A paper describes a structure:
extracellular pH, and works in conjunction with a cognate inner membrane antiporter. excreted by the antiporter in exchange for a new amino acid substrate. that it is a decamer made of two pentameric rings. central pore, with the CTDs at the periphery.
the LdcI at active pH (LdcIa, pH 6.2). 7.5 Å to 6.2 Å resolution. whole upon enzyme activation by pH and the binding of LARA. decameric state upon activation and incorporation into the LdcI-RavA cage.
Residue numbers in the entry:
A (entry chain A), B (entry chain A): 1 to 366, 368 to 711
C (entry chain A): 1 to 237
Write the structure that this text describes.
């Protein structure tokens, strides 16, 4: 951070000569000077360049034209204002917060002013950096303790080996030096939540609107189990989103709990809809508690808010309606709700406490910017605060990496204030622009084109409501004033279905677009038969949007030319030269699309997930038997009427189909049929294989699963 | 890695001029040339400098004098040998492995030979680097995928914020770029153990003599729970070292198991002795199984090998004697046993399989060189290999940091081959040298001095046996050919006790030496009333030994001068100026030592840990009640006759005194007396406070604990 | 191939200074920068100069006036377009094939963007070069086999004689090094029509509209006799 901008020729030597003396002194003081073209470029430089860290200007020439403009961009940015005799402060400045150092044009002040600027910059750095990181960096720069562990001592052990020296030199000293232990007593202790760590926790809770915040460095997988084992004793009943993560299966296998499931809805498109109001109401819950053996009133619920496709709950409705004392919003999808006014009344932490209830958000910091495994637990309400820490300490590692912790705290430091508000605004503006660009190209293009699944008007900034009286969303009997489209989650639709949800004569399966994007190194978040998801994060700049936009039009252009698979997908070709030698892209698309139409795939997929297998025993009870070796393998075909030992997780659509302890029957045969069909259809094309976790493909294309013995 | 050494003036222009042409060409090809003083300096340079990566020499001038000497140091080091007409290969070279490129002295080969050397160096780099890291580094250098997550995209998001730019710039690009996900498909997958990860696991298991090896990035805390939940079903009986880590308490609180405890012995010094042979024998185990309600024959044992103070078990004896099918050596202290012949027959993995038993080592890689949280599970024997992975995946994070993983694999790459054998030899040689230096200064010093607790002869390389017929160790009725002193674990003894284990009239409590070392930034591993432990790791070089050695003689010198506390310990002074204003170091020592003698501390400490509180219920049963809020706080004094809710962990001596579910009685009052005494004696001197985890000091010096309600 | 053209003064320091930082970084990265007089000279430079291998320009200043014009000249030529906030893609671009890398004006990207341009240029080279020649050139640059014939080993035998050294030095290393045999197994075999040679034959036949194409290195004199002796038995008319 050493670039100083000068914005001017003033036309008078009496002013210009002292500035020359200062330029020269500053260059000799180890600053890089930069020169914006003009006033308009300066405002863009500041807006676009973080390394520009001060502005020198003539007060009269620029203040009445610049003050408020710069204050909107950065209210601490160093200004070095050169005053005249008649320069004064107009009452209009009263309400602005400005950090200003006033300087005169005079010889002999160079070394002094230079030192002040250098010193003032370090003073500013001290305000913006958070307290623990500040102490850590200062230690790495200045400290010198000997007779210390870790034994490698700032990476010293790595330098004794050529291979170690390569690893050291590749990552660099800072990475190696910032790997410290609690021997640095002045940083307090993460595990005791003491000293600067106390200050860190208060900082986080202050910004994120929590009562209390924990820093977890082993993901929300671990945050769930700390909350679970503290929250859900053996024999208790819990309400749990049937949409559950694997880590909650691992909890269920370890804790003797009885689940009752909230049940999402779905529409013909296959888009998940929210747990309808009926699921929260006393009458519905009582009926399921009535029908579930050993179930008592639920002591703990876990809802996923928002839904994946951006349907946010009226959280005021849920907090009021759901008669449960302990509600855990797994808000992994909406970590940013506190930072836009459009999400008020639509997030877990919104507003104040919930009388008579503890409310949790567990958040996967890593839809923000943070290293993988970073997760937070935000508590709104009262627990046994110290006892909760005993449970935390029993499941926390004793080898915490201080870099991972700093990267999680530094992601917060980034979002701080106004500028972090305007950062996310930028990504919204680009999403809306891109949305309108697709609509335009839809009209202008030759025949078919992509479409965006969205309302007819989107000229407004808001999460657009979805209503039972609207058709665009394609969901059946939707609740009103319930779900809202998040502008930043953009679902693109590939050709292949009609407005009915019935099949078009022309189709392009999305899997082929994925292979194309893979040759071009573009990552696709999630794919379905005719859908692809893109996240317009604060990562995604105009450069990537342009490349994506053009890449998408190129796929279309190239598809419609009917390029050879050999030429358009050489890596696919190498998988089976003979199979692919003369095939053109359209023929690949036609054949796969025809197979889809032939095997009736969409109707079978839809129906597979519209019923539920039968629970025979709990995963826990089944795992106890497994622990004693009471399992055998059988072929997938042989599984109807048997108790499943493993979870079976097929792709697509990427959600559990059978749990340990469940059994497929004739009533629920569509489950097995979908699975068998995926295995059969997937045998035909090299590069287009089946994918089922917990199943074992054999040489003849048959799959084995594990079952409980009798 | 660009420094090339040239070793010579040959006295002939016809040889010297081509070497000049090569020097100049090499400098222009971006190499740094270095020039050892002579042959003897070269051998020391190689031995001391890892960045020296090639040697150029005249073949005849040096081969018959150098070949074997260099081969002993590094059998791949590039040699650039300049041959004469009569140069040939003597049969004596047959058995040496040499990687040699032969070159002639001729003009016109510079660019070609330079490229070969550059190319050959890269070829060598490729041999020594492990395969996954090689692919990762190559990706970071060459790769260019777009439309990718993580959203920060090589740290890009950090650069939008001045504070983020500081964090990015401090740690550096490599740290930020090597933070990748499984989107890098060509590295396979840690969680699937596929592709290069498969190769990595085979590599590790090959070097470490395991059947199978798992890479765990959340410490042996997590490795224990994966092994535990797979290994110890509810209702089972386990044998568990009463010397247990907290993570095993967290397991016990989560699993309904019945423990029977192996019981260590101890001597008057307070040094732990090994579980005596009696504890492993069928008759002893049967008696405890007989006396323990609901206990059946143990299905799983967990022994800590070696002991802390270097008593290694005849592991052949244990594997033969202990009639348990599943034995887990928590070998956190001896990760290096496979690499010295002196440890044969004295480590878990030594030899071959154990017929009829699975044997585990869980190891805390972070007494080697690796980042905190790095842990391995080494399996010797058969489990359900795939099912074990289901249990692994349920407790593994989904946010693995690829740097932590590389640092664990790179610690292995370092230990590879001969040179990693000679690395540890160096630390042994220095330990022995330092040991003899203490003995010398003991004789030569003025009056009292430190002593090393060790046999009378140590001129031999071996782990010295401790025998019942020897007095030096101070343990009572020791088993023979059982315990052995590890040369690298050095216990220093401070004045204060006689050969009897009775108290000297003159004493210097070790706590005062710790404060002195803290002013000098030296870390002490562990301290007791009159003892201090130092680890002579591969970290500890001659520079640190000299500073430590002198620092220790300076403490003595300064103590005997009777310096003011104000001057020798200014930070301590600031804690209570009035208390410390005029006190001299000897007066501080005298008063604290007199307090120790007065309160009879050593006799009370010894007796406190010689009995066991009574188990009323299990920690699990107590925690279930806690989960329902069935706890109250009472003062520490009020705890006899009540069921404890929390673990109480006092310092000293740093091991559990009361478990949840246990109760102090009159029979075991020494437990409570020791605890109360520590609170009382610790009130007198600022900077010398009590330390009990799970106790709450009140303003009047009384402590509160948590108990179960009735 | 290292000359990069820059076409402009934009009148604003906020744009000009990052371009200066890039000019300087590029010159230090071993590129020659060239500066066409103006837009009309640029189109003539491209048309007349094959060593000009990339164009840097402000997107708004030039796209609606240049895109189709450049695409007519060379549809792979690297364009380094510097975007503004309001820059977008008009539907008129739909039918054009463009190979575009989009870059922002920002400090701190020099070494990274420089490496991308260098890397992207090598990536482009890989598209345009035919597969066997690509492998051959790469071998001559990187390969290092010993215990090999030809005995001269990359012209080595020529350097033992002053007269041979003159012939070697006159024709140059590449001529001497590219004189190889089938010992370079990864190029397949002309005589077996295998591997990359198969690909070469399919390439030629594809462009020249043949069913099959043979590569003859002894003129159509020899092609006539191969066709003749196969085609015209004794006693035929």
């Amino acid at each position: 951070m050493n670039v100083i901008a000068i914005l001017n020729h003033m036309g008078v030597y009496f002013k210009e000569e002292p500035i020359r003396e200062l330029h020269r002194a500053l260059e000799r003081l180890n600053f890089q000077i930069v020169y914006p073209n003009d006033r308009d470029d300066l405002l863009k430089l500041i807006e676009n360049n973080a390394r520009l860290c001060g502005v020198i200007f003539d007060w009269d020439k620029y203040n009445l034209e610049l003050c408020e403009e710069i204050s909107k961009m950065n209210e601490n940015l160093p200004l070095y204002a050169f005053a005249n005799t008649y320069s004064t402060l107009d009452v209009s400045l009263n309400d602005l917060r400005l950090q200003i150092s006033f300087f005169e044009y005079a010889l002999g002040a160079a070394e002094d002013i230079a030192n002040k600027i250098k010193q003032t910059t370090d003073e500013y750095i001290n305000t913006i950096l958070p307290p623990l990181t500040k102490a850590l960096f200062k230690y790495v720069r200045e400290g010198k303790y000997t007779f210390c562990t870790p034994g490698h001592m700032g990476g010293t052990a790595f330098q004794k080996s050529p291979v170690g020296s390569l690893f050291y030199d590749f990552f660099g000293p800072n990475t190696m030096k910032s790997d410290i232990s609690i021997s640095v007593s002045e940083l307090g202790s993460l595990l005791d939540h003491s000293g600067p760590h106390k200050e860190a926790e208060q900082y986080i809770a202050r910004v994120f609107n929590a009562d209390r915040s924990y820093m977890v460095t082993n993901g929300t997988s671990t945050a769930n189990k700390i909350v679970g084992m503290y929250s859900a004793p053996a024999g208790s009943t819990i309400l749990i989103d049937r949409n559950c993560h694997k880590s909650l299966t691992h909890l269920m296998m370890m804790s003797d709990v009885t689940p009752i499931y909230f049940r999402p809805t779905r529409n013909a498109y296959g888009i998940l809809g929210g747990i309808p109001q009926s699921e929260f109401q006393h009458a519905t819950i009582a009926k399921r508690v009535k029908e579930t053996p050993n179930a008592t009133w639920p002591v703990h619920a876990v809802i996923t808010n928002s839904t994946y496709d951006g349907l946010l709950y009226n959280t005021d409705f849920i907090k009021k309606t759901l008669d449960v004392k302990s509600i855990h919003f797994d808000s992994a999808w909406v970590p940013y709700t506190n930072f836009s006014p459009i999400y008020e009344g639509k997030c877990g932490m919104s507003g104040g406490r919930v009388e008579g209830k503890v409310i949790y958000e567990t958040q996967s910091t890593h839809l923000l910017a943070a290293f993988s495994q970073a997760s937070m637990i935000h508590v709104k309400g009262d627990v046994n605060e110290e006892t909760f820490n005993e449970a935390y300490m029993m499941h926390t590692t004793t080898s915490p990496h201080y870099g991972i912790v700093a990267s999680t705290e530094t992601a917060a430091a980034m979002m701080k204030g106004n500028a972090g508000k305007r950062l996310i605004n930028g990504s919204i503006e680009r999403a809306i622009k891109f949305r309108k660009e697709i609509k335009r190209l839809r009209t202008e293009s030759d025949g078919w084109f992509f479409d965006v699944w969205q309302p007819d008007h989107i000229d407004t900034t808001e999460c657009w409501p979805l209503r039972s009286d609207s058709t665009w969303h394609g969901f059946k009997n939707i609740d009103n004033e319930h779900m809202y489209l998040d502008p930043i989650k953009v679902t693109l639709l590939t050709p292949g279905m009609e407005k009915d949800g019935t099949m078009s004569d022309f189709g392009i399966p999305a899997s082929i677009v994925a292979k194309y994007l893979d040759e071009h190194g573009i990552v696709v978040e999630k794919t379905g038969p005719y859908n692809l998801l893109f996240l317009f994060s604060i990562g995604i700049d105009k450069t990537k949007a342009l490349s994506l936009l053009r890449a998408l039009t190129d796929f279309k252009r190239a598809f419609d030319l009917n390029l050879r698979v050999k030429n358009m997908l050489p890596s696919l070709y190498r998988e089976d030269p003979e199979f692919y030698e003369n095939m053109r892209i359209q023929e690949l698309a036609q054949n796969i699309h025809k197979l889809i139409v032939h095997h009736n795939l969409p109707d079978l997929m839809y129906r597979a997930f519209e019923v539920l297998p039968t629970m025979v025993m709990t995963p826990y009870a089944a795992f106890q038997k497994e622990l004693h070796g009471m399992t055998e393998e059988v072929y997938l075909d042989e599984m109807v009427g048997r108790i499943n030992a493993n979870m079976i997780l097929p792709y697509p659509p990427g959600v559990p189909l059978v749990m340990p302890g469940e059994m497929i029957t004739e009533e629920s045969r569509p489950v097995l049929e979908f699975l068998q069909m995926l295995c059969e259809i997937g045998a035909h094309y090299p590069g287009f294989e089946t994918d089922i976790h917990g199943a074992y493909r054999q040489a003849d294309g048959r799959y084995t699963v594990k079952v409980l013995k009798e």
